[PDB]
Amino acid sequence: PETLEARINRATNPLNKELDWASINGFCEQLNEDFEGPPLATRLLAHKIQSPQEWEAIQALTVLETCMKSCGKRFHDEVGKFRFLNELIKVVSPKYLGSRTSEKVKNKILELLYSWTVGLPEEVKIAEAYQMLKKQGIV
């Protein structure tokens, strides 16, 4: 076994020639049995998502997507928090570093935010984030 940080580094390594599903899954599963998992994974994911390296960010968006399925309520609540959501907004927003972000990474972020809006009508902060982007014309 290994810690959360090494696990996510391996799952988002810009050298990976292809999605590393064993690392992606292991991270989510590991998170599932870690008493401090969710808040910690959220912080690591934000940082990788903001990466200038596109492959790293895409892989990091794939972990995020996967954990949202596999990790249930405890994880959904943490993703649904202002502090995490505001880090995502930064990547797609002209005001921060959205001008340099690849269309691919941007497209993925808006797709996830939209799916969560529809799929988890209860994480109200996600829908607030989504409407804001819509109101600014980003989506």
UniProtKB/Swiss-Prot annotation:
Tissues expressing this chain: Ubiquitously expressed.
Locations listed in the record: Golgi apparatus, trans-Golgi network membrane; Endosome membrane; Early endosome membrane
VHS domain sequence ranges: 11-139
PTM: Phosphorylated by CK2 and dephosphorylated by PP2A. Phosphorylation of GGA1 allows the internal DXXLL motif to bind the VHS domain and to inhibit the recognition of cargo signals. Ubiquitinated.
Function comment: Plays a role in protein sorting and trafficking between the trans-Golgi network (TGN) and endosomes. Mediates the ARF-dependent recruitment of clathrin to the TGN and binds ubiquitinated proteins and membrane cargo molecules with a cytosolic acidic cluster-dileucine (DXXLL) motif. Mediates export of the GPCR receptor ADRA2B to the cell surface. Required for targeting PKD1:PKD2 complex from the trans-Golgi network to the cilium membrane. Regulates retrograde transport of proteins such as phosphorylated form of BACE1 from endosomes to the trans-Golgi network.
Domain notes: The VHS domain functions as a recognition module for sorting signals composed of an acidic cluster followed by two leucines (DXXLL motif). The GAT domain is responsible for interaction with ARF-GTP, UBC and RABEP1. Required for recruitment to the TGN it prevents ARF-GTP hydrolysis.
Record's subunit section: Monomer. Interacts with GGA2 and GGA3. Binds to clathrin and activated ARFs, including ARF1, ARF5 and ARF6. Interacts with RABEP1. Interacts with RABGEF1. Interacts with the type-I membrane proteins LRP3, M6PR/CD-MPR and IGF2R/CI-MPR. Interacts (via N-terminal VHS domain) with SORL1/sorLA and SORT1 (via C-terminal cytosolic domain). Interacts with EPN4. Interacts with CCDC91. Interacts with HEATR5B/p200a. Interacts with SYNRG/gamma-synergin. Interacts (via GAE doamin) with NECAP1 and NECAP2. Interacts (via GAE domain) with AFTPH/aftiphilin. Interacts with TSG101 and UBC. Interacts with RNF11.
Family: Belongs to the GGA protein family.
Record protein name field: ADP-ribosylation factor-binding protein GGA1
Natural source organism: Homo sapiens
Gene field: GGA1
